[PDB]
Amino acid sequence: CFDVSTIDDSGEFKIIVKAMETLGLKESDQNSIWRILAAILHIGNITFAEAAEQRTGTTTVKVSDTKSLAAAASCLKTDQQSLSIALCYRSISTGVGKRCEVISVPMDCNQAAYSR
Amino acid sequence: CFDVSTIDDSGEFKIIVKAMETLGLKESDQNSIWRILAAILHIGNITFAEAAEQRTGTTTVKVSDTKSLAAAASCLKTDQQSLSIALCYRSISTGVGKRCEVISVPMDCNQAAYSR
Amino acid sequence: DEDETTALVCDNGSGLVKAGFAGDDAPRAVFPSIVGRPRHQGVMVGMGQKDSYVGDEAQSKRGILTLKYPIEHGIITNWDDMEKIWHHTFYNELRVAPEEHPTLLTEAPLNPKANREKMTQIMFETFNVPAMYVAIQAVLSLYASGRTTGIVLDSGDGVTHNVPIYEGYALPHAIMRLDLAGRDLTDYLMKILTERGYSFVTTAEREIVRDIKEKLCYVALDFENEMATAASSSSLEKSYELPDGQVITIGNERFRCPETLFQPSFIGMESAGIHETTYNSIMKCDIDIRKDLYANNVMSGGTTMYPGIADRMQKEITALAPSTMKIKIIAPPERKYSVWIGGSILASLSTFQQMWITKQEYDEAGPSIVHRKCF
Amino acid sequence: ARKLVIIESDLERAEERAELSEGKCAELEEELKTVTNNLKSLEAQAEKYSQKEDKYEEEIKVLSDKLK
Amino acid sequence: ARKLVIIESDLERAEERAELSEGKCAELEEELKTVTNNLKSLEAQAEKYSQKEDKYEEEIKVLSDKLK
Amino acid sequence: AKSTDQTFLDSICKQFEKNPHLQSYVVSKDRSIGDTCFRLKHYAGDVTYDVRGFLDKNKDTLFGDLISSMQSSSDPLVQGLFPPTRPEDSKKRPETAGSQFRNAMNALITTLLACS
Numbered sequence: 001c002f003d004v005s006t007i008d009d010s011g012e013f014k015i016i017v018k019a020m021e022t023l024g025l026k027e028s029d030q031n032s033i034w035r036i037l038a039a040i041l042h043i044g045n046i047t048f049a050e051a052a053e054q055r056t057g058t059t060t061v062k063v064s065d066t067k068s069l070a071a072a073a074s075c076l077k078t079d080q081q082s083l084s085i086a087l088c089y090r091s092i093s094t095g096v097g098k099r100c101e102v103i104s105v106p107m108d109c110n111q112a113a114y115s116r
Numbered sequence: 117c118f119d120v121s122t123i124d125d126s127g128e129f130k131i132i133v134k135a136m137e138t139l140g141l142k143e144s145d146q147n148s149i150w151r152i153l154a155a156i157l158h159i160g161n162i163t164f165a166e167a168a169e170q171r172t173g174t175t176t177v178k179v180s181d182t183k184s185l186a187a188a189a190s191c192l193k194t195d196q197q198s199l200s201i202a203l204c205y206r207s208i209s210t211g212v213g214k215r216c217e218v219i220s221v222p223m224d225c226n227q228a229a230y231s232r
Numbered sequence: 233d234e235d236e237t238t239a240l241v242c243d244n245g246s247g248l249v250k251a252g253f254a255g256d257d258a259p260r261a262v263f264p265s266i267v268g269r270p271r272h273q274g275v276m277v278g279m280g281q282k283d284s285y286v287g288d289e290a291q292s293k294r295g296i297l298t299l300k301y302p303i304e305h306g307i308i309t310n311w312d313d314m315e316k317i318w319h320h321t322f323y324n325e326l327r328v329a330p331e332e333h334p335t336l337l338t339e340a341p342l343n344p345k346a347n348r349e350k351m352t353q354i355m356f357e358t359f360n361v362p363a364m365y366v367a368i369q370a371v372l373s374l375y376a377s378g379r380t381t382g383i384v385l386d387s388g389d390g391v392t393h394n395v396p397i398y399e400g401y402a403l404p405h406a407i408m409r410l411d412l413a414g415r416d417l418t419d420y421l422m423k424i425l426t427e428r429g430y431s432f433v434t435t436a437e438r439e440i441v442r443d444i445k446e447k448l449c450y451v452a453l454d455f456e457n458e459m460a461t462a463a464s465s466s467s468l469e470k471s472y473e474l475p476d477g478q479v480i481t482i483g484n485e486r487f488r489c490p491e492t493l494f495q496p497s498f499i500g501m502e503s504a505g506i507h508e509t510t511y512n513s514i515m516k517c518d519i520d521i522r523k524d525l526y527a528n529n530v531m532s533g534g535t536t537m538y539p540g541i542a543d544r545m546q547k548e549i550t551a552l553a554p555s556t557m558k559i560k561i562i563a564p565p566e567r568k569y570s571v572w573i574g575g576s577i578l579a580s581l582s583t584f585q586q587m588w589i590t591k592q593e594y595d596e597a598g599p600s601i602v603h604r605k606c607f
Numbered sequence: 608a609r610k611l612v613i614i615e616s617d618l619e620r621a622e623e624r625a626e627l628s629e630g631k632c633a634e635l636e637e638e639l640k641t642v643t644n645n646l647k648s649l650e651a652q653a654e655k656y657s658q659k660e661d662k663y664e665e666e667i668k669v670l671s672d673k674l675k
Numbered sequence: 676a677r678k679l680v681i682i683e684s685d686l687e688r689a690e691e692r693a694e695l696s697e698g699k700c701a702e703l704e705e706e707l708k709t710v711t712n713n714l715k716s717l718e719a720q721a722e723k724y725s726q727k728e729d730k731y732e733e734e735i736k737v738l739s740d741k742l743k
Numbered sequence: 744a745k746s747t748d749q750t751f752l753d754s755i756c757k758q759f760e761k762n763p764h765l766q767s768y769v770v771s772k773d774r775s776i777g778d779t780c781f782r783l784k785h786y787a788g789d790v791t792y793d794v795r796g797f798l799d800k801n802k803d804t805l806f807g808d809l810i811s812s813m814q815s816s817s818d819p820l821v822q823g824l825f826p827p828t829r830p831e832d833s834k835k836r837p838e839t840a841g842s843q844f845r846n847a848m849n850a851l852i853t854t855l856l857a858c859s
């Protein structure tokens with residue numbers, strides 16, 4: 001669902017803004033807060049177009065909608081490439097001396113959506 | 117019987133048409149309704165020319181007048197062949213997983229005309 | 233409620249457990265009568281194994297299972313496991329409790345007296361069942377098929393019954409019980425397969441025989457004439473790529489095992505074919521009661537579904553038998569489920585009340601209420 | 608550094624050719640599943656028809672004898 | 676240099692699965708044509724068997740009448 | 744990972760249904776209990792639950808590999824979501840967030856039973 005019959009969000013905002021300023025959250029601070037949520041929204045526009053690389057059972061993960069995927073990495077201010085390689089492919093090798101990453105291999109979609 | 121001495125259907129039609137339009141059944145809708153009855157009429161021109169395949173007691177069902185039989189399947193917009201195989205020969209095998217049809221064998225005429 | 237009471241229709245044997253919802257025509261819920269353990273040890277922790285695996289759940293994953301068979305055509309090796317077989321019927325498939333609706337079962341004629349009370353005790357004196365009954369196998373198919381005057385030979389998988397019922401029940405007998413159907417053929421194939429480097433030993437794969445059987449196996453029109461025809465590789469050899477990984481061009485393996493039916497000599501019994509015993513049972517009846525029997529023969533069961541079963545009977549009988557009336561064999565569309573078509577009937581009838589057993593009726597006559605009411 | 612750019616040019620080519628093949632391969636397998644289903648279906652009917660004519664000719668042979 | 680190996684290795688995996696898929700896909704495509712031809716052939720025979728047993732049907736019937 | 748919700752539900756009915764305050768459709772002969780549902784007695788009232796989610800919903804486990812990529816961010820906002828390692832909540836770190844829930848509520852009662 002999205003819309004609620006009892007709550008009026010559109011008309012409540014400008015009323016909340018006064019309450020936002022009551023505490024001490026000026027527009028300057030408001031904008032800073034909206035970015036955090038925008039980051040979450042950018043993550044929300046990121047799913048996995050079930051990569052059909054594998055032919056039968058298991059399956060890899062590939063992002064056809066790069067527009068949405070790039071939008072997140074753009075606002076997260078991180079390497080889009082490393083982000084896709086590090087997440088889609090988990091790294092493990094922490095021998096006290098403290099890790100050597102990148103070694104991995106793709107996994108099913110359920111686990112991908114789960115880790116997501 | 118067919119004709120009635122007290123009722124005049126031929127002269128009543130054009131009078132009913134006005135009543136048909138009174139509610140909201142325009143000619144466009146009228147034609148759509150006549151098809152449903154036409155389907156029933158096509159079923160009405162379908163009997164079973166007692167197939168003389170069996171030599172004595174029991175008997176199968178075969179349609180010599182394919183013209184009439186085809187007319188129905190034509191307006192019903194279904195496979196004439198499957199229609200003859202599925203009806204003349206009943207299917208049963210619904211094991212929850214939900215059925216595997218086609219297994220059957222012919223039956224007497226009385227049951228055929230009854231199921232009809 | 234209102235105009236709805238809901239009555240279950242069940243018919244168990246040695247091959248399938250046929251069941252449905254209420255007032256149905258054909259069996260809805262069906263599953264193999266199996267219940268084994270884990271020879272393997274369940275991973276034990278990746279589930280405290282238990283559930284022998286049953287229903288369309290055990291047959292799906294056989295291999296691992298140690299399938300044990302309780303009901304070998306009549307005799308029950310053990311009644312303790314039966315409790316966990318009926319725990320799958322009403323609950324898993326039907327999704328209804330036995331403490332709500334009546335129940336209907338089948339009766340194999342001439343069944344051990346101890347079995348009557350044993351079965352009834354499992355319901356009434358444990359799992360509350362308001363009302364139930366155990367109708368007699370064959371008689372049901374008679375009415376559904378629409379026959380008044382017939383000689384019924386109902387044979388699904390368990391045992392063979394030559395029931396000349398065509399007007400009434402409980403007369404001298406003219407009925408027989410033979411352990412030569414279905415599962416008997418399933419065990420015979422593996423025996424002869426050994427002559428061609430094939431050996432389906434245990435039960436798990438023994439079930440596969442049944443699968444391969446009902447898709448090619450047939451009965452020779454005439455073994456003697458088809459012997460010279462064996463030279464031809466068109467009507468005999470039939471390729472069958474086993475869905476596991478093996479090609480078996482069965483040719484003379486299809487009509488060798490079913491031959492056991494007409495030839496009990498292949499299983500060590502003086503008993504003759506099913507067309508000799510037919511004479512044996514008919515001759516013990518009235519003399520002016522035969523002419524109508526030959527006129528109409530009722531052949532029901534899955535054994536009559538095999539290609540080349542009805543035509544052969546019209547060849548051997550006419551040879552040495554009264555030759556005056558028309559000879560005709562009746563084989564309904566689905567002559568196997570003919571029992572369930574008639575089983576659903578009696579369950580949906582109201583006159584059926586003056587026959588079944590009611591909750592209170594049991595306590596009024598004790599455990600002998602069964603043989604006091606039915607017979 | 609230059610070789611790192613060249614090696615990528617050949618990677619995308621093999622990925623597409625494999626995906627394009629898998630797309631048709633799956634379609635052919637699905638088609639085969641449908642054809643093989645009707646194949647054995649027609650074979651069953653063909654065997655049945657063959658069984659019918661055999662019984663017919665046998666009965667007809669008898670009718671001819673009785674007719675004479 | 677290490678990144679190069681990673682991508683270069685992927686090229687080997689991509690090239691391997693491509694030639695393997697295309698190889699089997701081509702074999703499958705060719706097989707479908709053979710199976711399809713067999714379907715059309717068997718279907719034709721079944722049609723001839725169906726129309727034949729239907730001819731014996733009207734034949735065994737008229738003979739039964741003449742016999743009566 | 745393979746023991747789905749359904750398998751876990753089975754571990755409850757067998758291990759228990761003997762200890763007070765629990766029922767189902769198998770042990771308790773009552774049609775009111777669906778085959779895909781189970782009964783659970785509270786301090787008084789009775790409630791029937793569904794087994795949808797359970798595992799993946801409760802687990803919420805996120806190990807380094809995926810987190811590490813975010814912790815090493817230069818942006819003050821992103822790294823802000825990952826404070827300088829355990830703020831007054833250290834103990835051991837890796838052991839799912841579902842089990843961590845129990846710990847959060849247990850730490851709550853512990854400080855409730857030490858005051859007036």
Ligand SMILES: Nc1ncnc2c1ncn2[C@@H]1O[C@H](COP(=O)(O)OP(=O)(O)O)[C@@H](O)[C@H]1O
Nearest residue numbers: 245246247248388389390446533534537538568
């Ligand atoms: N079309 C068929 N042709 C030959 N055998 C069949 C066919 N359909 C079912 N069967 C067989 O019939 C048997 C089941 O018949 P059924 O009457 O239900 O037995 P039971 O009542 O003894 O459990 C199984 O061995 C099955 O393989």
Ligand SMILES: [Ca+2]
Nearest residue numbers: 387388533571
């Ligand atoms: Ca039967």
